[PDB]
Ligand binder design. Structure first.
Ligand code: CL
Ligand code: CL
Ligand code: CL
Ligand code: PD
Ligand code: PD
Ligand code: PD
Ligand code: PD
Ligand code: PD
Ligand code: PD
Ligand code: PD
Ligand code: PD
Ligand code: PD
Ligand code: PD
Ligand code: PD
Ligand code: PD
Ligand code: PD
Ligand code: PD
Ligand code: PD
Lengths: 247, 247, 247
C-alpha cells in the first residue's frame, strides 16, 4: 500500500475528513437538530443550564421563579424565598428577611447551535410577573436579538452563537423566553402543508435538560466538553469542535 | 400659547389621548399579546393565579394535582395529599385521613384579555384523571364556551372577558385546559404558510406566571391593579383600565 | 311487543350495539382524541404513568430526572440522588453513595390509543443529557418505531398499540419523547391553512396526567380498567374494551 500521509490513497484520512464533514453538514440539513441553551449564573459561582434540542425550531421559556437558584437536597430558605418573590412581583409586597436574594441570577448567557439561522432568533425578556414591556397592552411579544449574538469560533469555524447579558442591578428581575429556527436556505417551507404535522410533532419530540453545576469549571469539564457543545467562558475563551473539512 | 383645556391646540391633551388609544389598538393588532388567566379559589381565601401571555394564541393546561393548593415553605400534609389523590382518581382508592381536602379549588375564574376573539375560546374540563367526558372513546377534546363569557367593562369599554364556575360539590374534582386565539378581523391567516413558523415560535416565546396570593384583596392590590389587568371580584366589581380614546 | 333476543325489533339491543359502535368510531374521527401513555417500571414494583390526551396529535417528552422514581410524601434520598444524576451525566462526575439507583426505571412501555396511525409514531430516546445519538451533530431527532408496536387486542378488536423495552443494564440511562398523530384516512389535512390554528390550540388544550402506582395490580385495577384503557401486563395479558359492532 501507499505510505500514510503521502498520497491521495490515504483512504483512512479521507474517511476521517468525510466523517467530520458529514457531521457538520447533517446538523445543518433540515433533518438535523437545532439546540438552545440558557445559562443562569449565580453569585455562589454555580450555573443552571437549561437545554432544549429539536428539529425545525427550538426554544425555552422560564418564569422568574424557575430561574432562581435551587440547590437539590439542600436548604433553600424556601419560606423566605416565597416572600422574596412577593416583594419582587410588587414593591414592598413581601415580608422577606433579606434585601437581595442570592438565588437571583447575576447574568444570563443564551447559546444556539450553529444550525440556527441567527436572523430568526427571538427573545421575550419580561419582568418578574412575565410581562415583556411594563404592561401587556403596549408589549411586543419578542425582540429579534440576532444582531447581538457573537460567533463562537474554533479553528476559524462557527461552532455556535452567544448572547450574554449581566443582571448586576437590584432591578434586574426577569422572566425569559428565547426561540430560534433551524437554518433553511431552501424554498421548501418546513411549515407548509406538506410537512406541518411533522413540525407539530417536533413540539412533542424535543428533548429538554436542566441541571445546576457548582462552578463554570465543572460545567466546562463535565457538560460542555464531553458533549462537544459550544460555549464562551467568563474569560472569553471559546469552546467547541470544528468539524467541516477537518480531521 | 393657548390655555390648557380650551382649544384644539392642547397638544399635551391630544398626545395623552393618542398614547392611550395606541396602547388599546396595538394590543388588538396581530403584533399584540393575547393573555389568559386561570384563578383557582381555595377555602382558606387564597387564590392561585396562572397566567400565560403570547402572540397569536394562548392557553393553559393543568392537572388535577397542579390546581390543588400548595403553600410554599409551609406544611402541606404531602403524604396524606398523595393519598387524597389516589382516592380522587378512583373511589376508595386511597388511604387518606380526611373526607374533603381543603386544598381542592372551590371555584375557578378564567379571564381573557380583550384581544381574544371570544368565538375562539375552547375549554377542556376533564375529570381528575384528565379525561374530558368519562371515557376517552366518547370525549370531544374541548367545548367552545365563549357564549358564557361575561364582558368585564370599565367606563363602558371591554377590558376583558370572564367565565366563572363554582366547584362547591364533593364530586367537582377537575383537570382543566383553556385556549383562545387573538382577534384577527383580516383575511391574513397568521397560520398560513407565510407566517406559520412564527406561530411555532410563539409556542416557545409565551411567558408564563404562577403564584398563590393569600386573599382576593392581596390579588387585587398587588397583581391585578398594578399590572392594569382585567378582573371580576366576588362582589361582581370590575377591575381594569379603559384606554380607547380616553385621557 | 316482540320477545327480547328473537327478532329485528329488539330496539334495545340495536341501540346498545350502536352506542358501542359510535364510541369506537367517534374516537377515530378527526373530532376524536388520540392518547399516549408512558409507563416507567421500577424495581420496587411501582409504576409511573404519564398520559396525554389531545386532538390531532399527541406526545410526551421527559428528562432523565423526571423518569426517576419519586415517592410523594416519603424520603427519596434527594441529596444523594442529585449526586447520582451527576454521575450519570458524566462518568465519575458525582459523589453518590450507591452503585445503582433503584429510582432508575427498569423498563418502559409506550401505549397509544387505537386512534393513532402507527406509521406516524416517532420516538426520541436520548441519553441522560437529552441527546438522541451521542452528539447533537450526528443525531436524527427521532426514529419511527411503529413497526415495533404490538396490537393490543380484545375479542379480536385492536384496542391499542404497545411498544415495550427493558432497561436492565447499568448503561440504560435515558431521556425519552414520543409522539403520534391521529388517524386521518381523508385528504383533508388537519394542519392545512383552514384548520391549522385549531391544531395550535390543541397544543394548549391537551390534558396531561401523571401518578405513581405501587404495583402493576393497582395500576390495572384502579387506572387501566376503570377508564377502559388499553394495556399489556407483564404476563402478556391484554386489557381494554372491544366496542365495534358489539353489545
Ligand atoms: Cl435537507
Ligand atoms: Cl396587524
Ligand atoms: Cl371526521
Ligand atoms: Pd441555608
Ligand atoms: Pd448597567
Ligand atoms: Pd409548539
Ligand atoms: Pd432541573
Ligand atoms: Pd482564551
Ligand atoms: Pd399542617
Ligand atoms: Pd350545583
Ligand atoms: Pd404549540
Ligand atoms: Pd408557581
Ligand atoms: Pd361594584
Ligand atoms: Pd429512605
Ligand atoms: Pd441486553
Ligand atoms: Pd405544539
Ligand atoms: Pd406527577
Ligand atoms: Pd393471558
Amino acid at each position: 500500500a501507499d505510505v500514510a500521509g503521502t498520497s491521495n490513497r490515504d483512504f483512512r484520512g479521507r474517511e476521517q475528513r468525510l466523517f467530520n464533514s458529514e457531521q457538520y453538514n447533517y446538523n445543518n440539513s433540515l433533518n438535523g437538530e437545532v439546540s438552545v441553551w440558557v445559562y443562569a449564573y449565580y453569585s455562589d459561582g454555580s450555573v443552571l443550564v437549561i437545554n432544549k434540542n429539536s428539529q425545525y425550531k427550538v426554544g425555552i421559556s422560564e418564569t422568574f421563579k424557575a430561574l432562581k437558584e435551587y440547590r437539590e437536597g439542600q436548604h433553600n430558605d424556601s419560606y423566605d424565598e416565597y416572600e422574596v418573590n412577593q416583594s419582587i412581583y410588587y414593591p414592598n409586597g413581601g415580608d422577606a428577611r433579606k434585601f437581595h436574594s442570592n438565588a437571583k441570577p447575576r447574568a444570563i448567557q443564551i447559546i444556539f447551535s450553529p444550525s440556527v439561522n441567527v436572523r430568526t432568533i427571538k427573545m421575550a425578556k419580561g419582568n418578574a410577573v412575565s410581562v415583556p414591556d411594563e404592561y401587556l397592552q403596549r408589549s411586543h411579544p419578542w425582540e429579534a436579538t440576532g444582531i447581538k449574538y457573537r460567533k463562537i469560533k474554533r479553528d476559524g469555524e462557527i461552532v455556535g452563537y452567544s448572547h450574554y447579558f449581566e443582571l448586576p442591578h437590584e432591578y434586574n428581575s426577569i422572566s425569559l423566553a428565547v426561540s430560534g429556527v433551524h437554518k433553511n436556505p431552501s424554498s421548501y417551507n418546513v411549515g407548509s402543508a406538506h410537512n406541518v404535522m411533522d413540525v407539530f410533532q417536533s413540539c412533542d419530540l424535543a428533548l429538554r435538560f436542566c441541571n445546576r453545576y457548582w462552578a463554570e469549571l465543572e460545567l466546562v469539564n463535565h457538560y460542555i466538553s464531553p458533549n462537544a457543545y459550544p460555549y464562551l467562558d467568563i474569560n472569553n475563551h471559546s469552546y467547541g469542535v470544528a468539524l467541516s473539512n477537518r480531521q
